[PDB]
Ligand binder design. Structure first.
Ligand SMILES: C[As](C)(=O)[O-]
Ligand SMILES: C[As](C)(=O)[O-]
Ligand SMILES: [Zn+2]
Ligand SMILES: [Zn+2]
Ligand SMILES: [Zn+2]
Ligand SMILES: [Zn+2]
Ligand SMILES: [Zn+2]
Ligand SMILES: [Zn+2]
Lengths: 330, 328
């Protein structure tokens, strides 16, 4: 079976150790093309990303999933360039994030479904690169527009077998909202990762979703504004919980018997224009390991806590391949 | 003081009959590239725009100013292809419209100034095509962010000599609040067009801005949903006033002695994705002339009402050239 990447299809055996929720750059549609100097230059951004991916590769990573949507400024040509240079597979995304422009947010559920299908079945822009995942997002109480996006995502997943990754901004729960909508459309929970789940400490909430068959994205592990009391922007974006506390949720879910439902990532990037200026510097100061943080810090931490190799490989290799492999029915 | 167009620099004498507020396509950044099918295809949109601009050309139009900004999905390569095929000058825009994404709306006044300067001085994207105007938009009361945009526009204009064009959302006013900000930055009123000024019938407001040396953009002349009362989206976009009512404002300002302050346009486009689906069909149902509406309908209407042809030539040829020619 085959997974689409920015350099073409690859087999399941080629996927390897995967980071399921990452970005090369967090931006806005067309922004990198219109003002590349915001990032120093396109060339500087490419250099920062290639070095960062090569560090991750040296720590064991073989694939990342860039869950940047059109409205997060996804540039698949950038992804292809850095994937080739770093020799790390990149899966690209369709879907809608938090900042849809009018041309997206004025659209109907049917139109959004056709847009997602175009990006998965035909390709992104004029590149022939096909999305391998659908990324959606909601705020607090799912808005009428976000509900349209979720339903369109479920429909595109049902037609193509590609999985859906979702999260709730602003609050620590919210996965129940998305689950009810997805299920109303007939989508299998095994096609869905409820992301940014490490933002809550409510284990009962995560375990119940896992028991229903949802994948649980513990994918903002290195985000933390501890020590950055000076910075309101940093606390608002990364939060005030230690990375070890977040990582321990991984062990907790394993102990509950749901290793098979866990996906782990960094939610990192190599440039960011969608927040305050120079926020990349703040992030880099918190986590100098970048995307290598999971393999260099979290994996050893879990081992020390007594999680066996084979379990860690199940989480980092087996689960992502099962998740990404397009699967029409469960 | 040559003017930059999507085909390169031109002389003032080459500008000719100008439409000062137009669009090839009203969209969002990256959207035409991502989902061209929304417009049938990119190829269909080009064909429709070339056909339309050629009709305007035959009616005498020589230049249009496409005031689409980054966030209105300005695609300068589309502009260039259409300009060349139709053989009509197109001036491209920098600035910020009413849908800035986070990467724009999180920026400071200094950062916005740099962005506008890049698009004017260096070029748009990787094309080397330089913006010839700065477009800004406000809602009701200028928002804190919109005030940054206005100040950045003023600063970019002062540094480069290129003019600024505005508008305020809806059938509002807003010019007095825009002008205050511009003047606090030391910008000359002669470098600013208060656009969509045909949305109001308040002549006291219009004449006072004209008296201060502002240009008055009477530039949505064909927009009217009269006859389309059962379409709320039509009414909300084009209004309930007739084209003649809008066009009579041109006469009113001429009568008051302000012919030199008037700029006229259609605010037309050949595709639109930033609003309701298929809205282009509704607009085309009302104004089949498209961008040719000004020279075909408005000019003769004003002639019939007794305005001398020399005055109309001043408004359609002289005023736009004086406005577009960069100063310092
Ligand atoms: C690009 As994000 C901070 O919503 O994971
Ligand atoms: C794109 As418009 C409605 O400001 O002319
Ligand atoms: Zn997120
Ligand atoms: Zn995320
Ligand atoms: Zn993310
Ligand atoms: Zn407008
Ligand atoms: Zn307009
Ligand atoms: Zn307009």
């Amino acid at each position: 079976d085959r997974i689409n990447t920015v350099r073409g299809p690859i087999t399941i055996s080629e996927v390897g150790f995967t980071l399921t929720h990452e970005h090369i750059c967090g931006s806005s549609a067309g922004f990198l093309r219109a003002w590349p100097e915001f990032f120093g230059s396109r060339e500087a951004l490419v250099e920062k990303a290639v070095r960062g991916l090569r560090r991750a590769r040296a720590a064991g990573v073989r694939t990342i999933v860039d869950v940047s949507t059109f409205d997060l400024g996804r540039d698949v040509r950038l992804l292809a360039e850095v994937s080739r240079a770093a020799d790390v597979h990149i899966v690209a995304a369709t879907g809608v994030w938090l900042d849809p422009p009018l041309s997206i947010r004025m659209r109907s559920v049917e139109e959004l479904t056709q847009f997602f299908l175009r990006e998965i079945q035909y390709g992104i822009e004029d590149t022939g690169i096909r999305a391998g995942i659908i990324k959606v997002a909601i705020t607090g109480k799912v808005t009428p527009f976000q509900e349209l996006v979720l339903r369109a995502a479920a429909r595109a997943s049902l037609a193509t077998g590609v999985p859906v990754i979702t999260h709730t901004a602003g609050s620590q729960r919210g996965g129940e909202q998305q689950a009810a909508i997805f299920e109303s459309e007939g989508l299998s929970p095994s096609r869905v990762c409820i992301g940014h789940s490490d933002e809550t400490d409510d284990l009962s909430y995560l375990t119940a979703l896992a028991a229903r068959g949802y994948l649980i994205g513990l994918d903002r592990i290195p985000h933390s504004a501890i020590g950055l009391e000076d910075n309101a922007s940093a606390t608002a974006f990364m939060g005030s919980r230690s990375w070890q506390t977040r990582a321990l949720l991984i062990k907790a879910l394993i102990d509950q018997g749901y290793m098979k439902q866990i996906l782990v990532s960094n939610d990192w990037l190599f440039g960011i224009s969608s927040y305050v200026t120079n926020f990349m510097d703040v992030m880099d100061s918190v986590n100098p390991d970048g995307m290598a943080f999971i393999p260099l810090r979290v994996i050893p931490f879990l081992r020390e806590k007594g999680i066996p190799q084979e379990t860690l490989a199940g989480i980092t290799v087996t689960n992502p391949a099962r998740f990404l492999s397009p699967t029409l029915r469960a």
